[PDB]
Amino acid sequence: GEGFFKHCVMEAETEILKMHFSRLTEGRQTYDWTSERNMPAATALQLTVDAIKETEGPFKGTTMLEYCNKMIEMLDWKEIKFKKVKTVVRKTKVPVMGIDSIKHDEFLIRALTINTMAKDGERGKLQRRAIATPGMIVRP
Amino acid sequence: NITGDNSKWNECQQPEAYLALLAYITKDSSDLMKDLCSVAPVLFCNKFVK
Amino acid sequence: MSKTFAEIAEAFLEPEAVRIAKEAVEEYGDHERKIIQIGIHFQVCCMFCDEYLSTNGSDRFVLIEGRKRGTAVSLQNELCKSYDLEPLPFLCDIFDREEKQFVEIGITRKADDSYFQSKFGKLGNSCKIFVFSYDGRLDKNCEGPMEEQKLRIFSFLATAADFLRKENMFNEIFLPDNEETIIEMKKGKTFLELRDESVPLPFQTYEQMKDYCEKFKGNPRELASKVSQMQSNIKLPIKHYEQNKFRQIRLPKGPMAPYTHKFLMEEAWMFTKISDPERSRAGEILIDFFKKGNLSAIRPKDKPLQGKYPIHYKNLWNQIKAAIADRTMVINENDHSEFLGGIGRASKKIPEISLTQDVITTEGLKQSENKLPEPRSFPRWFNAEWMWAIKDSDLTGWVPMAEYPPADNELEDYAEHLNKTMEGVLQGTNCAREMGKCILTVGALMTECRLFPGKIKVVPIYARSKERKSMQEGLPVPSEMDCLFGICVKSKSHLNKDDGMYTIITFEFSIREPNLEKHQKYTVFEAGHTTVRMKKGESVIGREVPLYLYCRTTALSKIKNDWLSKARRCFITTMDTVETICLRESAKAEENLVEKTLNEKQMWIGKKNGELIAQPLREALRVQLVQQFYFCIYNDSQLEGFCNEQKKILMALEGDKKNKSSFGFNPEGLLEKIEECLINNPMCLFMAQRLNELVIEASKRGAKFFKT
Amino acid sequence: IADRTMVINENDHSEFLGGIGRASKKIPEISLTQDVITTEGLKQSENKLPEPRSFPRWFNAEWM
Amino acid sequence: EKHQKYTVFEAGHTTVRMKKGESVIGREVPLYLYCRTTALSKIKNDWLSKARRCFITTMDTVETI
Amino acid sequence: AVVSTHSFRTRANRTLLNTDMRAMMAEEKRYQMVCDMFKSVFESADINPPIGAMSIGEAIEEKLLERAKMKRDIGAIEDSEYEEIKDIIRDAKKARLES
Amino acid sequence: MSLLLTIAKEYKRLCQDAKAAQMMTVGTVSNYTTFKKWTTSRKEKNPSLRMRWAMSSKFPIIANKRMLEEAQIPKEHNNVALWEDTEDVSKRDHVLASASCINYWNFCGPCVNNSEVIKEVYKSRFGRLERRKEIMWKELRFTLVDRQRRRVDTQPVEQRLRTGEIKDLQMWTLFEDEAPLASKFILDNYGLVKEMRSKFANKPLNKEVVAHMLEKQFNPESRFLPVFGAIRPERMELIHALGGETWIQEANTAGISNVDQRKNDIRAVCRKVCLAANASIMNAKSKLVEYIKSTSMRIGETERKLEELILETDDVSPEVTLCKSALGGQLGKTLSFGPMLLKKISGSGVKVKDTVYIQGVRAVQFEYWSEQEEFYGEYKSATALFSRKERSLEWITIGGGINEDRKRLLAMCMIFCRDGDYFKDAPATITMADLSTKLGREIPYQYVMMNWIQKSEDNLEALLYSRGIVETNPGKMGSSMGIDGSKRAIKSLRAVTIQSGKIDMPESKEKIHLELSDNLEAFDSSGRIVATILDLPSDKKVTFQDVSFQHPDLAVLRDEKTAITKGYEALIKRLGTGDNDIPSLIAKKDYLSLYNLPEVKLMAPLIRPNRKGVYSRVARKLVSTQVTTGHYSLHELIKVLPFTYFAPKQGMFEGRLFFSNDSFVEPGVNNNVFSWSKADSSKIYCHGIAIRVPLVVGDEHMDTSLALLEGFSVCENDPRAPMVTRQDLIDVGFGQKVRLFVGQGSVRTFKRTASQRAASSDVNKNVKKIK
Ligand SMILES: [Mg+2]
Ligand SMILES: [Mg+2]
């Protein structure tokens, strides 16, 4: 064809512009940067969107495009608030939920951060080739 | 015929070349979704590895 | 799912009504999705107009929206001719000949006021302006359309709204002058900077890379680029006959490889007990009923042969015997703490915060080091182990196998018969014995990890078997029983967030003198004397034979507990490999050769007296079953590297079989990867050496290979 | 019946005919001796007899 | 019991009516479709094809009396 | 899949509940009783994804009013009990508005 | 009673929590679909092994409480503890219990008479068993070449439909309370709605289950599968027991569902319709769409329109492509040329025009293609692979089974190839094949010589010999193709080799649609000539249980019968809109206005004059005695009504048979003129069918009196109209704006309406006007 890329990109634009961002929860494990741990994509996305809600207010986007717009808008945010459980010694340590703050400098690095997974279920190698699980802002 | 298998297939490929290629594919498509195509590679062009 | 916009539009809309959206969308403005928006509006007009003809051949309304722009201009000047009304600058949708006035129709998602103030701001009272919401909200100019068209257009807008909700397209369909202007992708200064320094080329600003991309036209200069790249890449022409040696296969040198199986096979000894259904149903009480026999009397001497930790194991044995009397849990809290972890010690951890001073003042001799496994050499005993697992044991079968399903003549006769024969052959083998004991005992441990976490329990090592008699008197009964290989001990089963591995202490009976070379991990004792007798046509008294007690400690991962708990899988992987051979042959002759192929077809099995030996496919089936069972038992990362890099050797070999002149590019590197994955694994090194012999005999048959 | 009273199905009648009678493939005796030496296909010989019934009731109503 | 060889269906409904001195409407009655398969020998085709013979064997037996 | 009588749900371990992960899950449970509530009100919620432009609470309230009118008009339930349900609905609308 | 109360109180508690209150308020209801996705994401790593660890414990299982206490004793027989009052692990209203109790209630439980309810829910599965009952068996062995990739319906079921519409059926049959009012599917396809909703709606058991199983009941799974050459979708269900690489089985094709032949009947229907559009070339675009939307198909158990069958049918025939092209259905990845089917796997190029000579010393333009292009040919019992370059075949290989079919493949693909020898043979082509006689239309040339080859037997031998013939070299012995289609390889054609085996079929998931040219040509994808004009010239008319309408150009319509049937259609169709129509009169109980109706005066002259009054007396009697509600049959009123107009005389003679121009219409007693259908709304007048949806309260329609009652539409939300449940909607009369809860929570308002009209034609006529 002469229109190969134009047409394939047309199909992609169609399917993505339709897409609710909730289907972003479908997939492998991804890196939740709130607690800085690896999580199933659904819970990690719940923490990301919930943090956006507690910082700037609830997210009404309901589309992949508006989710991406909010992602790129957060990079200019000078302050971000998290749901982070902090242990308080009451001497018994009760891990009381808390609200944490972060600065654009740290948040950018946390957004570009990828995490390592020591390989499991791989067949046929003596030495392990580890697999990476990128963050939630990079995924869409 | 030959059976080929590639080693370090991921370490050799680079998101910069993917940024150029994605810019080539989105040339005529739309300027609205092209800026949305170029954003994916640049997050792997500057990326942090734990 | 819908892959294209024309699909979405033509799905819920009228087929020809979409074509006007596509055509108008091609030229006057350039947006791909927005067809759907006007796909609503356009159709919203049509049902409006056709409905009324005013008492004349001429229609009541005329439609200027769907037409072409330049034509719509002049056709709007026609109205200045007919009714002499002011020539409005904004081109409206529809003109009424009954009301003789301008008509335009908006459609908005939000509350009607938001848009109606916009369009009313545009055209004022000069036109009849009707603004509908999909939800049933209504905004209008002075007078509304007739009662029928209201109802129809509102029903349509409602249904279309429900379709859009089902496909979840909402904010994108918003009115042009409100939301269409912001169709752009949000550009943050952080992202624009990141993108501007992310570009590969000597160009910095993203715009220059964008220009070189969009404007790119490649010339045919990649032929010289590819030939200069070829000159830079000097190497990798490849010829089989040049490297056909493959330097045979490299093999490690050192001490002989030990016995890595969690249990002993060839030298293991059995204790027979005829089983009660209600007594043996527990399977934990099996040893409690065993102890009422002669098992309780056996005790080892303090001085072992070839023991590493004699007194510990002896004390633990006495704790097992004492426990079995009361209950099968061992109560020693101090004893297990040292044995656990594979004599692994719990190492105290000092925080880094207080450690800095200990770096300034170095004490405790602070360093960091890791350790590697020591390589071993090709095992001898392994061959004897295979030859023992190959022959049929006196007991009939060790593996629980369910009943056969009902049969129809065509297939299930063939399938049921093949399964009856293969099962009948493989149940009698000693390999089936080790399979059965593995399933039963590792299942027992698997239950014990849920039953008593963090507790010490005595688990038997047993296998169930019913005895066969083919002499074929009708007889009293065939003997149904279960036999005991030895006793086993489990430590703490606690499960870490990372992987935990349980520790296990195995005690097995044996009639056989230990061999220091392969048993180095085992601690052997002189246990006692065991009575063994037979009855034959000869006198066959049998005397008594000394009994040795083998002890060791091993690690079991929960994953290993599972995959070793189901050993039955091996049968299937044998079955397929066997069954195919019988079909591929018979399918050639279009006849039933299965029974004939099993007995007649000869498979090369082993070598004796320097002569290649072959056995029929039914008895050589045991070789495949043993091979798969060893694959299950002996599986290490080393083994998987070995096989996954070995398939290349096999494919090159069959490449030289049919004389296809096969080649592989850096055989030194391939043999370095095969060498790299051979360390301590007995099965790995064994299949390596056997591969050497395969290369030798194949090179003798015809030479695409080398012999030293 | 709409077009013409012949049914065109060549596969359908083959199973129904013979009274659901199946066409049984015949193996010659000359090649059969080996199959006696090696018994396959479960070779046997048997014949069948009709199952007896009991006095009908409905017959009287049929006569009447 | 007697139809064991027959395969019966539920075919439909058939209309049946009469005219008498009474009202006799008749409404409708369900229609069943009986199916079966049988064997016909050519000899049976012939001897069953001529059933008129029965009359004669009755006639004689009657007429003699 | 055949449902028969034999299909059941498996209990999760006590692992994630002991660590702080539960202290984070306190939000997910708050989603839980919500989704379970809406599924009790709307039976096809899981099968057909809910649509229309309305709030979850608004649809729940008006639907509860419709079922209350249904059971009161023809079926058997008391009128004063209907008005009690209406009272609970409006009293719920108060606390819903305050947020 | 407290089941609603405790839900209301639960809502009170939930909205009292502000964190849950705001997330309940903000946004659409669609957020539920996201909210549910935020839970129970954790799954165990081990599929079986974790389950073994689960069943190891004696009381692992979560089970309900109330039902067990209601039916059966919680305590055991053997004194092994069963029940406790403690809820442990996850906290939910279910209390934990042992596994064996399930077995106990399966043993001694008190349940009766569930048998009939089960099967027709799972009739997909139960039927897939029923089919295995009747088959016979034979076993052998061979080295079998299966056809590797066919995308073919597996698990086929009658009345198969698309996923969206079957979701609509799901919503309507599961529950009425929350459902959208969905026009397109419910209006046209009603009567399957009546059946499914009728059987599943009355006994509220396993709502979710029955739903998700009915989703799979109507959904044939078309996967990419190896087949050994029996392509009927019934054999696809169980292939494994039947065939494989070494497998063989016999006595199958006989037993099949009624769908397999019905599809072919639809192919013949599209044949006749496309012929009707072929008769008049004034316009082919506007007529064929009429012939489509007018025709009504009768599926064995259900009446369904031809539009929704054509658009949504799975199998794409050369005809079916033409019938879809008139509509907006997108079905691509299909090439149709004559009887042959083709798929394009490679290359591209532009259509060019080249004028080349015939033997009659005359020049005619030929449109050819210059591309290097690799396509897959498909013909009856034969498959092959061809590649053409610059208007001549480059590479060819034949995988066909039968020799004749191989020759046909070779021929047809040579026709599509269009070599130079294509021009050299012209034995009397011009006299007939040159000019097709349809309003003086010149028929395209590829199809011209295609038809010349379809003509006689020697015409095949002509072009078969037109290819180069050479004695093939050793090593091509098995691949060589004789003139008659054999492998003897003494003499063989050039640039062709047979393969021993079949040839795999490509597949692509793609949708492409474009408008059709006036000659029944589809230029879709800006070229590609996929419509192949007329595939086969069968001149035959045979139909069984099929409906046509609107000047079909086939004459089934007598004068007297069109007088009777059209006279009925005036009454049936024109009534139901508003006051002074049948529904308002029936609601008023006044049947006198119903007698005097002006549409009855149209029917009056057609009755037999002799008994006219004698008929009218019994007719008026029947209509009057049904005025009492609940006793009236709404079809019998239409059947009986037209005879009431004349002054009743006391006949005393029976009026059962009503002669209308010497044809009788009896009460009940469905006949040629009047067919009275049971348990669904329709009726048949000879070869055609009509029905009126909006108002039918006829007593047998109880299951959908909520669905059928709708002739309404949406107007405005302004009045405060009492919120009426769907069962309360039957009471509100005409012109009454009322407020109603719709679907998933969006609430709108309606009145009694003239139904939506001219969904298509309203746009089509204006689009034609603007040109
Ligand atoms: Mg306009
Ligand atoms: Mg406008």
Side-chain angles (χ1 to χ4, degrees), chain C residues 41 65 93 104-105 119:
Chain C
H41 168 273
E65 170 62 270
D93 304 333
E104 212 201 357
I105 302 91
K119 230 167 191 60

Side-chain angles (χ1 to χ4, degrees), chain C residues 12 50 59 151 558 566 587, chain G residues 52 143 184 713 762 769:
Chain C
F12 86 105
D50 199 21
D59 306 335
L151 288 151
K558 187 174 176 31
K566 311 179 260 243
Chain G
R52 302 168 69 176
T143 306
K184 292 180 178 178
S713 162
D762 260 352
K769 288 183 179 181

Side-chain angles (χ1 to χ4, degrees), chain G residues 13 77 126 252 318 325 354 526 561 586 591 706:
Chain G
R13 271 189 296 165
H77 206 77
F126 273 89
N252 311 49
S325 57
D354 173 29
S526 180
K561 280 180 176 177
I586 291 190
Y591 54 102
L706 315 178

